[PDB]
Design an enzyme around this catalytic site. Structure first.
Site, PDB file in Angstrom:
ATOM      1  N   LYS A   7       0.858  -1.189  -0.112  1.00  0.00           N
ATOM      2  CA  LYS A   7      -0.073  -0.007  -0.078  1.00  0.00           C
ATOM      3  C   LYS A   7       0.937   1.225   0.034  1.00  0.00           C
ATOM      4  O   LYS A   7       0.753   2.099  -0.873  1.00  0.00           O
ATOM      5  CB  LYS A   7      -0.894  -0.148   1.161  1.00  0.00           C
ATOM      6  CG  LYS A   7      -2.276   0.309   1.056  1.00  0.00           C
ATOM      7  CD  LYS A   7      -2.583   1.786   0.555  1.00  0.00           C
ATOM      8  CE  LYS A   7      -2.389   2.702   1.642  1.00  0.00           C
ATOM      9  NZ  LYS A   7      -3.235   2.200   2.943  1.00  0.00           N
ATOM     10  N   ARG A  10       2.809   1.322  -3.479  1.00  0.00           N
ATOM     11  CA  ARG A  10       1.837   2.249  -4.462  1.00  0.00           C
ATOM     12  C   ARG A  10       1.633   3.733  -4.339  1.00  0.00           C
ATOM     13  O   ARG A  10       1.608   4.549  -4.943  1.00  0.00           O
ATOM     14  CB  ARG A  10       0.248   1.421  -4.314  1.00  0.00           C
ATOM     15  CG  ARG A  10       0.348   0.001  -4.549  1.00  0.00           C
ATOM     16  CD  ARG A  10       0.343  -0.015  -6.235  1.00  0.00           C
ATOM     17  NE  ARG A  10       0.235  -1.360  -6.811  1.00  0.00           N
ATOM     18  CZ  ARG A  10       0.032  -1.812  -8.117  1.00  0.00           C
ATOM     19  NH1 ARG A  10      -0.189  -1.080  -9.015  1.00  0.00           N
ATOM     20  NH2 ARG A  10      -0.023  -3.050  -8.288  1.00  0.00           N
ATOM     21  N   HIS A  12       3.590   5.861  -2.504  1.00  0.00           N
ATOM     22  CA  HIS A  12       4.805   6.809  -2.458  1.00  0.00           C
ATOM     23  C   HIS A  12       5.620   6.218  -2.887  1.00  0.00           C
ATOM     24  O   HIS A  12       6.273   6.824  -3.864  1.00  0.00           O
ATOM     25  CB  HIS A  12       4.973   6.710  -1.006  1.00  0.00           C
ATOM     26  CG  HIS A  12       6.037   7.579  -0.690  1.00  0.00           C
ATOM     27  ND1 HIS A  12       5.830   9.042  -0.151  1.00  0.00           N
ATOM     28  CD2 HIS A  12       7.405   7.509  -0.256  1.00  0.00           C
ATOM     29  CE1 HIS A  12       6.901   9.580   0.057  1.00  0.00           C
ATOM     30  NE2 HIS A  12       8.033   8.617   0.100  1.00  0.00           N
ATOM     31  N   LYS A  41      -2.997  16.991  -0.609  1.00  0.00           N
ATOM     32  CA  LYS A  41      -1.778  16.685   0.262  1.00  0.00           C
ATOM     33  C   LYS A  41      -0.652  17.644  -0.188  1.00  0.00           C
ATOM     34  O   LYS A  41      -0.355  18.188  -1.593  1.00  0.00           O
ATOM     35  CB  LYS A  41      -1.193  15.267  -0.336  1.00  0.00           C
ATOM     36  CG  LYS A  41      -2.211  14.089  -0.001  1.00  0.00           C
ATOM     37  CD  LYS A  41      -2.728  14.001   1.524  1.00  0.00           C
ATOM     38  CE  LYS A  41      -3.946  14.599   1.886  1.00  0.00           C
ATOM     39  NZ  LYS A  41      -4.141  14.536   3.389  1.00  0.00           N
ATOM     40  N   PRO A  42      -0.037  18.443   0.762  1.00  0.00           N
ATOM     41  CA  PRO A  42       1.020  19.485   0.546  1.00  0.00           C
ATOM     42  C   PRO A  42       2.126  19.131  -0.279  1.00  0.00           C
ATOM     43  O   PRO A  42       2.492  19.759  -1.403  1.00  0.00           O
ATOM     44  CB  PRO A  42       1.336  20.086   2.018  1.00  0.00           C
ATOM     45  CG  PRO A  42       0.973  18.947   2.801  1.00  0.00           C
ATOM     46  CD  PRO A  42      -0.110  18.190   2.206  1.00  0.00           C
ATOM     47  N   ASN A  44       4.287  15.064  -1.602  1.00  0.00           N
ATOM     48  CA  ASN A  44       4.625  13.759  -1.525  1.00  0.00           C
ATOM     49  C   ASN A  44       5.956  13.240  -2.214  1.00  0.00           C
ATOM     50  O   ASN A  44       6.041  13.953  -3.097  1.00  0.00           O
ATOM     51  CB  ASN A  44       3.509  12.982  -1.966  1.00  0.00           C
ATOM     52  CG  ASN A  44       3.334  11.349  -1.800  1.00  0.00           C
ATOM     53  OD1 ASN A  44       4.231  10.879  -1.186  1.00  0.00           O
ATOM     54  ND2 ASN A  44       2.501  10.674  -2.835  1.00  0.00           N
ATOM     55  N   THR A  45       6.735  12.636  -1.315  1.00  0.00           N
ATOM     56  CA  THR A  45       8.047  12.659  -1.770  1.00  0.00           C
ATOM     57  C   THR A  45       8.467  11.356  -2.332  1.00  0.00           C
ATOM     58  O   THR A  45       9.063  10.368  -1.753  1.00  0.00           O
ATOM     59  CB  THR A  45       9.040  12.932  -0.626  1.00  0.00           C
ATOM     60  OG1 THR A  45       8.680  14.037  -0.016  1.00  0.00           O
ATOM     61  CG2 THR A  45      10.390  13.253  -1.166  1.00  0.00           C
ATOM     62  N   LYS A  66      11.492  10.446  15.254  1.00  0.00           N
ATOM     63  CA  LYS A  66      10.852  11.450  16.180  1.00  0.00           C
ATOM     64  C   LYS A  66       9.437  10.937  16.801  1.00  0.00           C
ATOM     65  O   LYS A  66       8.426  11.492  16.798  1.00  0.00           O
ATOM     66  CB  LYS A  66      10.506  12.896  15.275  1.00  0.00           C
ATOM     67  CG  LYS A  66      11.885  13.604  14.844  1.00  0.00           C
ATOM     68  CD  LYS A  66      12.646  14.181  16.202  1.00  0.00           C
ATOM     69  CE  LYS A  66      11.797  15.445  16.460  1.00  0.00           C
ATOM     70  NZ  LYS A  66      12.689  16.221  17.349  1.00  0.00           N
ATOM     71  N   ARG A  85       5.459  18.956  -4.618  1.00  0.00           N
ATOM     72  CA  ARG A  85       4.628  19.774  -3.827  1.00  0.00           C
ATOM     73  C   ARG A  85       3.755  20.883  -4.581  1.00  0.00           C
ATOM     74  O   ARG A  85       4.087  21.196  -5.687  1.00  0.00           O
ATOM     75  CB  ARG A  85       5.892  20.838  -3.483  1.00  0.00           C
ATOM     76  CG  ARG A  85       5.703  22.021  -2.388  1.00  0.00           C
ATOM     77  CD  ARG A  85       6.802  22.717  -2.010  1.00  0.00           C
ATOM     78  NE  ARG A  85       6.523  23.861  -0.929  1.00  0.00           N
ATOM     79  CZ  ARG A  85       7.402  24.679  -0.414  1.00  0.00           C
ATOM     80  NH1 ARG A  85       8.839  24.414  -0.511  1.00  0.00           N
ATOM     81  NH2 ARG A  85       6.989  25.648   0.385  1.00  0.00           N
ATOM     82  N   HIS A 119       6.256   3.106   5.826  1.00  0.00           N
ATOM     83  CA  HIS A 119       5.985   4.532   5.962  1.00  0.00           C
ATOM     84  C   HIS A 119       7.382   5.350   5.472  1.00  0.00           C
ATOM     85  O   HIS A 119       8.279   4.824   5.670  1.00  0.00           O
ATOM     86  CB  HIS A 119       5.287   5.335   7.248  1.00  0.00           C
ATOM     87  CG  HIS A 119       3.845   5.252   7.271  1.00  0.00           C
ATOM     88  ND1 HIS A 119       3.257   4.069   8.135  1.00  0.00           N
ATOM     89  CD2 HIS A 119       3.115   5.926   6.608  1.00  0.00           C
ATOM     90  CE1 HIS A 119       1.922   4.333   7.832  1.00  0.00           C
ATOM     91  NE2 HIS A 119       1.743   5.154   6.919  1.00  0.00           N
ATOM     92  N   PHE A 120       7.389   6.281   5.029  1.00  0.00           N
ATOM     93  CA  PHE A 120       8.380   7.366   4.539  1.00  0.00           C
ATOM     94  C   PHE A 120       8.442   8.401   5.979  1.00  0.00           C
ATOM     95  O   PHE A 120       7.531   9.033   6.188  1.00  0.00           O
ATOM     96  CB  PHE A 120       7.808   8.007   3.277  1.00  0.00           C
ATOM     97  CG  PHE A 120       9.075   9.331   3.130  1.00  0.00           C
ATOM     98  CD1 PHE A 120      10.303   8.940   2.217  1.00  0.00           C
ATOM     99  CD2 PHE A 120       8.811  10.546   3.323  1.00  0.00           C
ATOM    100  CE1 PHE A 120      11.155   9.720   1.970  1.00  0.00           C
ATOM    101  CE2 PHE A 120      10.025  11.474   2.945  1.00  0.00           C
ATOM    102  CZ  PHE A 120      11.035  11.189   2.165  1.00  0.00           C
ATOM    103  N   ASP A 121       9.361   8.217   6.481  1.00  0.00           N
ATOM    104  CA  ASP A 121       9.710   9.031   7.923  1.00  0.00           C
ATOM    105  C   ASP A 121      10.220  10.420   7.292  1.00  0.00           C
ATOM    106  O   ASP A 121       9.557  11.436   7.768  1.00  0.00           O
ATOM    107  CB  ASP A 121      10.786   8.263   8.760  1.00  0.00           C
ATOM    108  CG  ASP A 121      10.975   9.275  10.004  1.00  0.00           C
ATOM    109  OD1 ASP A 121      11.692  10.256   9.925  1.00  0.00           O
ATOM    110  OD2 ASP A 121      10.244   8.771  10.751  1.00  0.00           O
TER     111      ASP A 121
END
Length: 124
Positions: A7, A10, A12, A41-42, A44-45, A66, A85, A119-121
């Site tokens: 997920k 897909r 990210h 979404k501001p 997405n990398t 963090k 962005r 996830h992408f930290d």
């Protein structure tokens, strides 16, 4: 089909085809994804690099996130992240992204059993 990590992949880790019309490319991706619904979404990398790389990374160098709960790993390698962005004359519903491709380190949040990228930290 797998979720969480697939997920994530897909959503990210868009190791897609050769870059062309990067704006449109990314606009298309997230428009198709529809995470723009209601609110855009501001940033997405999107990691535009091989899943094997990202998996290796997921078991490279752990760093204290963090959170002090999530177990996230820096990439020793740098890799092409596509920082889309909302800047390309972004005006809801006309959300249009500035697709910045850049090659630097990623910080992937690993989880699950086995340890997969979920996830992408961050990146650096």
């Amino acid at each position: 089909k797998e979720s969480a990590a697939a997920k994530f992949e897909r959503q990210h880790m868009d190791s897609g085809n050769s870059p062309s019309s990067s704006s449109n490319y990314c606009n298309l991706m997230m428009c198709c994804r529809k995470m723009t619904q209601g609110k855009c979404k501001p940033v997405n990398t999107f990691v535009h690099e091989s899943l094997a790389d990202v998996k290796a990374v997921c078991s490279q160098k752990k760093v204290t996130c963090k959170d002090g709960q999530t177990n996230c790993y820096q990439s020793k390698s740098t890799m092409r992240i596509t920082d889309c962005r909302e800047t390309g004359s972004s005006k809801y519903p006309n959300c249009a992204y500035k697709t910045t491709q850049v090659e630097k380190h990623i910080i992937v949040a690993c989880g699950g059993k086995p340890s997969v990228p979920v996830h992408f930290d961050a990146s650096v």
